[PDB]
Structure 1
Amino acid sequence: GAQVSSQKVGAHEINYTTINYYRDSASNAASKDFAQDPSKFTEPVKDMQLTLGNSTITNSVVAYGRWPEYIKDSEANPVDQPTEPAVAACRFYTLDTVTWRKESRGWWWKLPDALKDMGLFGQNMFYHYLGRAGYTVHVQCNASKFHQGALGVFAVPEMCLAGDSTTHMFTKYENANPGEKGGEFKGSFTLDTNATNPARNFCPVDYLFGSGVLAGNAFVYPHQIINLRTNNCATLVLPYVNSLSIDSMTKHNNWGIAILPLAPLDFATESSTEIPITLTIAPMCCEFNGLRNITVPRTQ
């Protein structure tokens, strides 16, 4: 059972044979213009009015070109019946509005963490052992034609943020899951030296994107730019991304949302100018498994 493959000859003066000797395939040797070869990695658009449940919204990227979907029967690990709340949980929830000033270094949120106290979605999340959902994130920021500024919105799978102490991986659960308030990036790294009552919080540096990588490369993640001269809003459609078909929503945050001011806010000649940014997130294709008594995580 010999495999006769062809070689690619370079310097000329053409087939090579390979035979597998082991039953386990892990023992085998390795076999080896503007158009984007990886069209799915260049933030493909949905190519209006988005209605989910009883919520309606009137610049849309699909992360990795993959729309949210339910678990295939071929890839279902759990065996118990899945709860699908449907319109009850799959609807747009509006988080607390943040304020963009000339001095803002950026904001961040975690999903599903930011929606843990959002109507029936939070109830289903805390009542079940396993949960899964994609998202539609709508960032809203409007300003006059005389305002200038640009925001970069990034959806990062496994958005791990650096700590603030010499102790590695020391950020406690409460500070890593702030909820809908989220957190803010910082312009510099400040080390927490309070060995008695350590803050045990993140210290996400903006130009390091909070994880030791240059912010300029954050555009490799699914992203959208809100340039105030052009558009008001940004829509990101995030499919469920994980190494598992379904996981624990309380333990693990599948996505992170980062908003960084790429161009600082400015207006006329008023040094005092602030415009709100409003996030509206709708979970999509929710499904839960493992119903039992409700989880009540520790707070503060």
Structure 2
Amino acid sequence: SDRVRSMTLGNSTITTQESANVVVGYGEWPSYLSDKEATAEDQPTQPDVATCRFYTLESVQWEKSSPGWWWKFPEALKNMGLFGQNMHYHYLGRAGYTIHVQCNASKFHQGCLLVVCVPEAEMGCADTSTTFPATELTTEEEPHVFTSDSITGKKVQAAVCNAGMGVGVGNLTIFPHQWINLRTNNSATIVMPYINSVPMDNMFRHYNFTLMIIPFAPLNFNEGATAYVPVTVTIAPMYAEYNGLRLAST
């Protein structure tokens, strides 16, 4: 059946029993950078399993009032195994991420998550005049929550309706998107390839994409149901190739 899925990228494996078809990012499977499309002359470091494995990020509780969360990849993968180590020790890096968001909910739970990988989701500042610091959008440890309404200050505009990029969140399905509907789905897998203008880019200054998990239907459970419904992102970079060995950047 299509509901069952098993992804064995690297050492870590993910097995699911209610998971719809995995959304290959824009219909193209990730692969190593070809010689035709390569602009860096350094020898590419290609750990097939050291870095191309499923990294389980911090699980965030999907509350009833939770408007959404976002992870900024690949910067959200800092301090996460040898992928983060290679990020630190390389000037240029390319990876195709097969994000797998796990939301285990019972048959009595009402809710739906748009798990969408937005390539280059330029976030808007809460105050348009200024620019937010890096901490406001970076997702090194915890997902950055979209606010239900407008916020102010030197932060990221977290209005869920505008998805933080001045863009209609309902139209976010234009990007590689999968829906975790607790009626049917408990996990969404998006195999997003390396998406950038330059064939390889630095993994700190530039975030290749943002995984936005937007609860369009808020979690609705009657009393007695599990209140701590976790939204666990398990992202596995695929065909990760790095050029430009350098001093570790911290």
Normalised TM-score (structure 1): 0.77
Larger Rg: 1
> 1:222: which partner in 2?
176
> 2:201: which partner in 1?
247
Question: Which structure is higher in RCO with an 8 Å CA cutoff and minimum separation 6?
Answer: 2
> 2:139: which partner in 1?
178
Q: Classify the secondary structure of the residue corresponding to 1:73.
A: coil
Asked whether the 8 Å contact 2:151–2:159 carries over to 1, the reply is no
> 2:59: which partner in 1?
97
With over 3 angstroms needed to count, the CA separation of the structure-2 counterparts of 1:65 and 1:108, relative to structure 1, is: same
CA distance in 1, matches of 2:160, 2:10: 36
Q: Classify the secondary structure of the residue corresponding to 1:86.
A: coil
User: What is the Cα deviation at residue 269 of structure 1?
Assistant: 4.1
CA distance in 2, matches of 1:81, 1:251: 22
Asked whether the 8 Å contact 2:136–2:144 carries over to 1, the reply is no
CA distance in 1, matches of 2:166, 2:175: 15
- Given residue 251 of structure 1, which amino acid in structure 2 is its aligned partner? R
> 1:131: which partner in 2?
93
CA distance in 2, matches of 1:123, 1:146: 42
> 2:117: which partner in 1?
155
- Given residue 176 of structure 1, which amino acid in structure 2 is its aligned partner? L
Q: Classify the secondary structure of the residue corresponding to 2:26.
A: helix
CA distance in 2, matches of 1:201, 1:137: 26
Asked whether the 8 Å contact 1:161–1:203 carries over to 2, the reply is yes
> 2:240: which partner in 1?
286
> 1:88: which partner in 2?
50
CA distance in 1, matches of 2:136, 2:201: 21
Paired residues, what number?
242
Q: Which runs of 4+ in 1 moved over 3 A?
A: 269-272
CA distance in 2, matches of 1:52, 1:272: 31
Normalised TM-score (structure 2): 0.92
CA distance in 2, matches of 1:266, 1:175: 29
Asked whether the 8 Å contact 1:109–1:180 carries over to 2, the reply is no
Once the two structures are superposed, residues 135-173 of structure 1 have per-residue CA deviations (whole angstroms, 9 ceiling, x without a partner) of 0111111222111111111110001111122424x1122
CA distance in 1, matches of 2:166, 2:246: 39
Give the 5 Å matches for 1:31-42. none
Once the two structures are superposed, residues 170-190 of structure 1 have per-residue CA deviations (whole angstroms, 9 ceiling, x without a partner) of 112233323131200011112
CA distance in 1, matches of 2:11, 2:228: 31
Q: Classify the secondary structure of the residue corresponding to 2:135.
A: helix
Q: 2:74 aligned with 1:117, yes or no?
A: no
CA distance in 1, matches of 2:112, 2:244: 43
- Given residue 228 of structure 2, which amino acid in structure 1 is its aligned partner? E
- Given residue 134 of structure 2, which amino acid in structure 1 is its aligned partner? Y
User: What is the Cα deviation at residue 203 of structure 1?
Assistant: 2.1
Q: CA RMSD in A?
A: 1.6
> 1:106: which partner in 2?
68
The alignment-based identity, stated in percent, is 52
- Given residue 80 of structure 1, which amino acid in structure 2 is its aligned partner? D
Once the two structures are superposed, residues 56-111 of structure 1 have per-residue CA deviations (whole angstroms, 9 ceiling, x without a partner) of 11121111100001111111111121111221111011001100111101100111
5+ unaligned residues in a row in structure 1: which ranges? Answer: 1-44, 193-199
